[PDB]
From a paper:
Integration of retroviral DNA by the viral integrase (IN) into cellular DNA is a necessary step for virus replication. RSV IN is homodimeric in solution. The 3′ OH cleavage of blunt-ended viral DNA by IN yields intasomes with recessed ends, here termed the cleaved synaptic complex (CSC). We determined the structure of RSV octameric intasome stabilized by a HIV-1 IN strand transfer inhibitor using single particle cryo-electron microscopy.
Thus, we determined the structure of the octameric CSC formed with IN 1–278 and GU3 18R viral DNA in the presence of INSTI MK-2048 by single-particle cryo-EM. The final map had an overall resolution of 3.2 Å and local resolution reaching ~2.8 Å for the core region of the complex containing the two IN catalytic sites bound with INSTIs and viral DNA, which was significantly improved from the previously reported RSV STC X-ray crystal structure that was determined at 3.8 Å resolution. Well-defined cryo-EM density was observed for both of the proximal IN dimers, all four CTDs of both distal (flanking) IN dimers, two viral DNAs, and the two MK-2048 molecules occupying the active sites of the inner catalytic IN molecules. IN residues downstream from Ile269 were not discernable in the EM map. The cryo-EM map of the CSC structure shows that the CCD of the distal IN dimers position farther away from the CIC region, rendering a more cruciform-like, overall open conformation of the CSC when viewed along the pseudo twofold axis. The NTDs associated with these CCDs were not modeled due to low-quality density in these regions. Weaker and less well-defined density compared to the rest of the complex suggested that the NTDs and CCDs of the distal IN dimers are highly flexible in the absence of target DNA. MK-2048, the INSTI included during complex formation, is bound at the interface between IN and the viral DNA 3′ terminus, sequestering the two magnesium ions in the active site. The chloro-fluorobenzyl moiety stacks on the penultimate cytosine base of the terminal CA dinucleotide motif, displacing the terminal deoxyadenosine (dA). The displaced dA in turn stacks on the core metal-coordinating ring system of MK-2048. Notably, Arg263 from the CTD of a distal IN subunit, which bridges between the CCD and CTD of the catalytic IN molecule as part of the CIC, interacts with the Gln151 side chain as well.
Residue numbers in the entry:
A (entry chain G), B (entry chain H): 52 to 212, 221 to 269
C (entry chain D): 52 to 214, 221 to 269
D (entry chain C): 54 to 214, 221 to 269
E (entry chain B): 57 to 269
F (entry chain F): 56 to 269
G (entry chain A), H (entry chain E): 1 to 269
The structure:
Amino acid sequence: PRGLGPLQIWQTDFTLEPRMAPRSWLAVTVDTASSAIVVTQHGRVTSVAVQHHWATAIAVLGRPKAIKTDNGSCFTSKSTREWLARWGIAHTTGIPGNSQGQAMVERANRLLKDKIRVLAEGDGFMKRIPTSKQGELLAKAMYALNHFERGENTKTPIQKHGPPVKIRIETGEWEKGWNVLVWGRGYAAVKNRDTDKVIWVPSRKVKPDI
Amino acid sequence: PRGLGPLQIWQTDFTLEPRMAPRSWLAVTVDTASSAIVVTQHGRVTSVAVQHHWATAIAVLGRPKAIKTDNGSCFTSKSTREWLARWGIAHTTGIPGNSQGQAMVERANRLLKDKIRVLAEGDGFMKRIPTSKQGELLAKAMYALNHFERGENTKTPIQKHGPPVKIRIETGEWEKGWNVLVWGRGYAAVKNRDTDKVIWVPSRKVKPDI
Amino acid sequence: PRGLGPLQIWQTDFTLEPRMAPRSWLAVTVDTASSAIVVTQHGRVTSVAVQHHWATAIAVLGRPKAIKTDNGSCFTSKSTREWLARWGIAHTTGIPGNSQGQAMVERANRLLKDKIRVLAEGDGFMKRIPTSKQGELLAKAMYALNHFERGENTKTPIQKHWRGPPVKIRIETGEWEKGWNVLVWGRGYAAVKNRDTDKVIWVPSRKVKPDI
Amino acid sequence: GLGPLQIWQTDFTLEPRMAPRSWLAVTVDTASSAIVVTQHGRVTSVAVQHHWATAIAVLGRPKAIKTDNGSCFTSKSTREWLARWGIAHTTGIPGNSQGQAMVERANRLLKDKIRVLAEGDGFMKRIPTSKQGELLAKAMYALNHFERGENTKTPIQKHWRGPPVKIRIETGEWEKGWNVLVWGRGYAAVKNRDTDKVIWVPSRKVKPDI
Amino acid sequence: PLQIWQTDFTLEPRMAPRSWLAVTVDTASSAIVVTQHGRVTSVAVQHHWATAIAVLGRPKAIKTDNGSCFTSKSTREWLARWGIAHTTGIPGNSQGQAMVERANRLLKDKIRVLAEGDGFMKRIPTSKQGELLAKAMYALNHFERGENTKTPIQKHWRPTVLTEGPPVKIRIETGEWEKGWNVLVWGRGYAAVKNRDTDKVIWVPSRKVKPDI
Amino acid sequence: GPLQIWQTDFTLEPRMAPRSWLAVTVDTASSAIVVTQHGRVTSVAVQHHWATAIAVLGRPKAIKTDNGSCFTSKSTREWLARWGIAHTTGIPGNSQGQAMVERANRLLKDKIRVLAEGDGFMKRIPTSKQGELLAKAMYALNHFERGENTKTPIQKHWRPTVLTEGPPVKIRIETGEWEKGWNVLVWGRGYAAVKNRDTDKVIWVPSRKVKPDI
Amino acid sequence: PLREAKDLHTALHIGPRALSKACNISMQQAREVVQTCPHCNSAPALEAGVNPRGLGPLQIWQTDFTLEPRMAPRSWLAVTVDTASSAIVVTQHGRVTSVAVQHHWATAIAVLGRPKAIKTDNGSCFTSKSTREWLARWGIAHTTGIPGNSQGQAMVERANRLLKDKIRVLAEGDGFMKRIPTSKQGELLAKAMYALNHFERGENTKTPIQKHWRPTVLTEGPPVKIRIETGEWEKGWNVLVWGRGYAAVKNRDTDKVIWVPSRKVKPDI
Amino acid sequence: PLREAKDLHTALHIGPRALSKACNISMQQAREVVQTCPHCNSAPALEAGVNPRGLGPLQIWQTDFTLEPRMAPRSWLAVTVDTASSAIVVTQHGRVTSVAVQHHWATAIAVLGRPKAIKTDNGSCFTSKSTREWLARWGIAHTTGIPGNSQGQAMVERANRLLKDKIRVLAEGDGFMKRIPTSKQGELLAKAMYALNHFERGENTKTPIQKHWRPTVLTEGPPVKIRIETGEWEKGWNVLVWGRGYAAVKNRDTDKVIWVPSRKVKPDI
DNA sequence: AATGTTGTCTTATGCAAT
DNA sequence: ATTGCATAAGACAACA
DNA sequence: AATGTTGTCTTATGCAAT
DNA sequence: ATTGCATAAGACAACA
Ligand SMILES: CCN1C[C@H](C)n2c(c(O)c3c(=O)n(Cc4ccc(F)c(Cl)c4)nc(C(=O)NC)c32)C1=O
Ligand SMILES: CCN1C[C@H](C)n2c(c(O)c3c(=O)n(Cc4ccc(F)c(Cl)c4)nc(C(=O)NC)c32)C1=O
Ligand SMILES: [Mg+2]
Ligand SMILES: [Mg+2]
Ligand SMILES: [Mg+2]
Ligand SMILES: [Mg+2]
Ligand SMILES: [Zn+2]
Ligand SMILES: [Zn+2]
């Protein structure tokens, strides 16, 4: 868990998806800090597919300070080189897939493939997805994997990048700092401001403040 | 004219741009309160392109509630009309050219065309865009209108993107704007819509709102 | 006429037994209610002897609120009245030999004579008794009078020295029989106890009623 | 003591008041403190017999008379007096602590009370021939039927002679085996059945038995 | 129903140690009540009959055999206290102990099949004995046997579900109390009443309502 | 009348160390003296004193004191304004602002040593008995007479009497006419027992049957 | 003049009557100055809705446990009441293990039939593994109350107290003051069950058993006057059962069955 | 036929209604057959006479103690109420020592005067040596209640709860939620004493102070209808004071002053 | 998770008789 | 009209 | 040894007006 | 007569 903020260090790669065929290739941008995703679509490896990718990602999630990559042939191509020269962000090499350069974009590719597969089976497409439902099934996949928190954390990846009542205790006092969530017919549930935990208590055992 | 809140109101239209031939039939869509503009290309007026565009907008902006659109045989097509109910999104369609709801979208269309122009003749693809450059040029112009400026604002668009009862006050007048969450036999727990504050008011000082 | 109260009125007189001689004279002192008597059998009759006997009797028996004696020069003497003022007891006098308050005195006097005579004939002295056993004869006579009952009387003269409202209950027959006294009453029942068997039984408030 | 008419302690004393008949005779019941005094100005067998017998006439028939080794008390006359009276005799010095001492204390009381009575009448040390018996009899009456000390019953009164209810205790159960001694207006004292210890209890915490 | 009963004791080997199997069968309903007994006594019969009375009610007679415990005084004065008329019989007679023998057969078959279907062959666990007893009683009392159109319970109790309150009269405005009405609810101060013909509900004072017949 | 003007000052009493600053409150309509002692001399401590004194005696109308630092300091000023008492100052010891103050100071400085010598305390009463000493001194200074009249300060201040009747109420009568001349004695539930002002005739009458008079 | 009252209350917190008397004031200024202090009114309306019940026989049951010293060394008795008809079944064991509850429920099934639900508290052998899997195998619901108030099971607790009353009365009227021999355990058990079930209780005309086997349930009853929480009564509702304590009411269109206190309901017209 | 019922109750202990319905019986036989079992009626009349009071001012006082966390580290406050006029005096110390009670009673004497009696519970420094001889030296009675019920002094306990209410309301209406600084201790004490004493409480027309200093006491009041223990009511009696709760009545000849509940008294004619 | 209940007692009230 | 009755209404308690 | 109390709240009731 | 009012009556709570 590096302490640097978002928009700092990027990671990029492609993937081959015969489900999206004949548009069989995809790529996703991920950040070592926020782990947010931006997706494109293509059917061949070109120096301009990465350019579509970079434009889409920098538009969706702002600009990157630095990008770490692999030794692909078209990454050094003249077109994308002039593009980067205009941009202002540096380009870096590596050994293609070690533990320092490629951080999490590989697992991002795997997770995207399995998520698109599970969505395709949810709406009923086993073998491959046609060139129409591509955008829809994608959009559902990104929305589920970014707009919702995944795993466990104090803040969602997008964040990264009850009236008060007094309850009784067996001692017999009236503790303060409880908010009722659901008000049943003769029962109740209370969440404490500090400990943010819910406990169920009857109605004849609760009285509020003020 | 300035909205009330993001991800609650939307407005769309249809546009044709000759330089994107054959796929020159866009379907423009902009938010009102948050003023987010997103588009998607196609080459015929149809239910399939409309549903693709709306499903893309769903996850590029947010799950919709009720989108105000224009007249046509596409919004009102059986597939699209039942699609609106499938996603639970409503319709308040207006005149094909109604000034109250579509002047903003037409101005957005003018902005889009002008940006596409300026940036295209910036790079050097003057008249019409070939197959492999349309995606990147659309990305380039939307990029020019994502996170630099919108044109005038000091607060940019995507930087922004119980039963009612009357109660009583010492003034003697019965003020409205209060909804009860939890009830009691000597008071209540009312909350105003605007100030979203919960206060326990005695039952003597309430009466039903209509 | 005996329901006035013990240790209240005392009657006294001089009867001369034929046996106490040659210390012949004798003074008596009796109580109407308690039937308790005590004597000393002196050898002289005078106001001083009167008051010595009186203040032995009041020591023996109790504190009367009045002591009565027949009028005469043997009871109205001024030293006697000074003794009275020393004790503060009211006094009155009557005819010497009336039936107002002396019939019981003379009855007890004859009782003393007969008991003394039977005791003396039991011991072995028929007419006279030596000056050393007079007291012991008096002691036996006094104990026989006081501690034991005279005649059929259940109440001994001792028992008349220092001695719940009546209610009637309901039986299944409804008989309003007497003989019950409440001890710890309640608002739904009572705690009554019989006057002879003396057994406690809580009975309903809807079955008891007052006796007189 | 346990019961009167049981133990008699007769001793003789000298009071210069009744001189030349300055010797005195007094009996004391240790069980009742009752006193008999008969004037006798010559310590003799006849005198002690007469005083003993007048004491029997005054108080009651005893079961034992306790005196000392005075030669006028075990004489054949006194021995046969006790024999024909069916009581017991025990000798002494006297001067025992527990027994044969209350008689001396009573003698001190006798001398003090006769002295105060005489000085209240106007006699200092010598009393006339018509006053010695008077004063001794007055002292007898003052001592006998007027209570001396700090008791509730006079010395002659020191001569010869409920329903069950359950109560709730700290744990809340109701236990039987109690009875009411005294019953006021809002309180009652309850005595146990076996230990017979009396404790006080509110009227509301007692309920009857059977 | 509840007019004549029966009883017997038949050994069950698998029930060790408490292996003596009391049975009680009504005639007009053929219900069955069963409990375990470590060894037959003149108090075990009283225990079992108290249990049977709790489950079914109080019968009007009993027909057991001439067994030692059924004849001893204890049970005699027990039945005398309750009001149940004892009547013994020849130990095996068909004018008496016939349907109880049929119930013995039914119960033994049910116990065997339940024990085998629960995973046991010859020894039911000691903690699981009353479990099988209650299962047998439930199955033989609440489910039809063979071609019976009813179970023992329906014959025994007549489980009809009536829907109208008891017949009751109301103080008519002329002072009389006309019958043919039925209460439905006893609220506060008032007791809603229908009419057996018009089917109209009218709240009426509680002081003016009294039952019919 | 009573409770019109109050007074106050301090008094250095070395006999009660370490709490060596003792404050005195003196009424002038009845001279019912009230005292309290405080270790330091600040605003909050003397305000504590005033609070205790008003608790014992009640709300005055004016309080004439010296020109001291705290008697007119801010905290005291808005505090008294909140209470609503007309503060007044003057020359520190003038015969108008400390007339009865020094008299009661002499009385208290006498009583303190009188009782300290009564229970045998010469140099300094221990820090545990000053409270009871001051309470006893105030009891002997207020409930007991030191003048020469038949009215104690308590007799002057609270106007102590022993009544026999309460407020008069007007009963109405069965024909519908209300009637005064009757006074209430017992407010039994349902029924009031009201006495005839002339013949001392009490009668049990219902609750709504009676109304207050004037 | 209500401002002397305002200052007086804010600094002194006076009751309304003394404020009215102390500043020559009257109804309104007094009342709605005295509410203005939030400390003068904190508690004084505690909500209390009180309503467990089942509608028809064999619908809802309840369960608790009992320590009975007279039944040593088998003092642990389970209790089960059928809320619709108030019939009671109680069994005896040694420990509070799940097997005891197994046997108890099996016997209760054999006696009364098969219910649908069993409301309860959360015993240690009760939300246990074996008990839950066995209940699932039998196929009836299981609804635990709030974990800590033994009051949502008020019916089983009350019938528990009643059972203890009856059992003690029989035992110590039979000549056993402290405890029971092993011979009379079944005596007391079956006698308590027979006395409670087949003989009516209190004032009701109906026996618990022939309530349980020949029940009366109305299909459409009378109209009544009832609470909506809006504050006070409306009408247009019908009552199904109106017990002495609490009642059940039914809508005319929504067709709800809700248990509300008899305070909430009163007769129509 | 009542003897089927005799056997049925003796063996079964049935309620009277079921006995009447189960043997074709009527009122009497049922009622006084169901009496005959002593177990069917054990508790149901617990006697309750409830009456402490004093008649005139400075006659009877009361005392208790309070733990007040807001007043740390001097949390121990002594309370004293004058039963005739309900005037309250409260003082503050560190421990429950006898010296604290010394000072508290001295201050109460200085404020209210000299009483005659002080009823109470038996505190550890209370029936102690020093307190007892000091009270003897002052010369007033001292009557402890029953040792263990803190209820015979119900007045001081009730005024204790009231004082805690007032003190907490004043404290946390002043901006102190948990505890109080050493500066505002005297604030709270003096305000609590001033609010309660000089301002009326409840509905009564009279202030505690002008009850204590200008009391009203009747010399001969109205006739009433009251109890003897004999079961129900007699007349020929008069009432001295009839409080909201409980009253005092006086004979006409014996001239007794006895405190009896208001249930115990009702108006004459 | 998922809410008091009700037999027994007391008192008050109204009808019925005398 | 006064006493007694036949019933209805309200109050208390305790279950780990 | 030597007993519940009463401020605060709720509901019910009757007068007064409309 | 219906709604609202002005008051009286009754119910709950908690203090080591
Ligand atoms: C662990 C299993 N368990 C949990 C606890 C131990 N518990 C259980 C009980 O059966 C009871 C119980 O019956 N009561 C009596 C009671 C009290 C007040 C009422 F309103 C009602 Cl109706 C019943 N109380 C408790 C209790 O815990 N604290 C009062 C209790 C039980 O078995
Ligand atoms: C050792 C000194 N001492 C003895 C005990 C500790 N105690 C003392 C208290 O003041 C109280 C007290 O106030 N209350 C509160 C209370 C409870 C019920 C009522 F009815 C009322 Cl009139 C008051 N209870 C107790 C108590 O012991 N057990 C409930 C108590 C006390 O100081
Ligand atoms: Mg329980
Ligand atoms: Mg439990
Ligand atoms: Mg206390
Ligand atoms: Mg105490
Ligand atoms: Zn306030
Ligand atoms: Zn019985």
